[PDB]
Amino acid sequence: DQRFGDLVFRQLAPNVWQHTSYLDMPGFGAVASNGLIVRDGGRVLVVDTAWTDDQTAQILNWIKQEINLPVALAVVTHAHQDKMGGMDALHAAGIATYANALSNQLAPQEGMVAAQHSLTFAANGWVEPATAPNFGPLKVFYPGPGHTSDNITVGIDGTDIAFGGCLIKDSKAKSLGNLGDADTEHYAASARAFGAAFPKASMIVMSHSAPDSRAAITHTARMADKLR
Ligand SMILES: C=C1CS[C@H]([C@@H](OC)C(=O)O)N=C1C(=O)O
Ligand SMILES: [Zn+2]
Ligand SMILES: [Zn+2]
After folding, report:
1. Mapping DSSP to helix (H, G, I), strand (E, B) and coil, where does residue 30 land?
2. Domain range enclosing 10
3. What is the distance between the alpha carbons of residues 151 and 216, in angstroms, rounded to a whole number?
């Protein structure tokens, strides 16, 4: 995997890359955050911003250089900084942004810029397709409240990659990370719903670890069960 400015990029599959940015948090130093970049025909689709506007501009620059296709749309997976910190950059590049309607409602109070468009979901978790027009291989699933009440997840058609975002931790993880906004009562169930929603997916991309096996889902759920 490749360094570019302060960011790191790793190709996970033919038309799927994972982007990584860092933030110095005081007392623990640097923290990595992963999103996805996806080439679909003549378009590129982004899943999650970087921590900051500048890092997200860097993402766009790298897409210009390594793929040099226009960015059709971004999806952000909940209203925290690792996932929405760079909404202004995307808007300034005139890229269409999408989030959970709840994310857009929460964003002002979590100090984020709302996306331009709001996804809504069926009772079974699946995105209403009207609200996610022309997402190509991106299948968006709302697993229920866990890390945040608004956390959403994205599988990529034509790969065995699903993206858990901050919901899923790594199979050798010691805790569940920041639970200050979390739904402790439903977290295990939401992790497992994410599993069942993408049952064949075998490469689980996450916010804060390198891609992992489905034991990430299992281990995260088992960890959440001990918090209920
Ligand atoms: C490990 C951390 C601390 S750093 C990042 C934080 O970014 C603002 C957040 O989204 O809570 N998230 C997690 C997490 O449990 O996923
Ligand atoms: Zn978060
Ligand atoms: Zn996180």
Report:
1. strand
2. 2-226
3. 17
Q: How far does CA 218 lie from the centroid of its chain? A: 19
Query: What is the distance between the alpha carbons of residues 81 and 9, in angstroms, rounded to a whole number?
Result: 19
What ligand is nearest to the CA atom of residue 175?
1
B/e letters for 174-190, b = 16+ CB within 10 Å, e = fewer, are: eebeeeebbbeebbbbb
Kindly report the three-state secondary structure assignment for every residue of 72-110.
EEEECCCCCHHHHCCHHHHHHCCCEEEEEHHHHHHCCCC
- Give how many domains the chain has, as a whole number: 1
- Please state how this structure was obtained: X-ray
**Among the atoms of ligand 1, which is closest to the Cα of residue 179?**
15
Give the per-residue SS3 of 118-140.
EECECCCCEECHHHCCCCCCEEE
Which residues belong to the annotated binding site?
78, 80, 82, 147, 166, 208
Under 8 Å between Cβ of 100 and 125 = no
- Dig out the tokens for 101 from the structure: 């309607």
Shortest-distance atom of ligand 1 to CA 176: 15
CATH code of residue 76: 3.60.15.10
> Closest Cα to atom 5, ligand 1: which residue?
82
At residue 151, what is the residue type?
Answer: N
The secondary structure element, H or E, covering residue 218 is helix 215-225
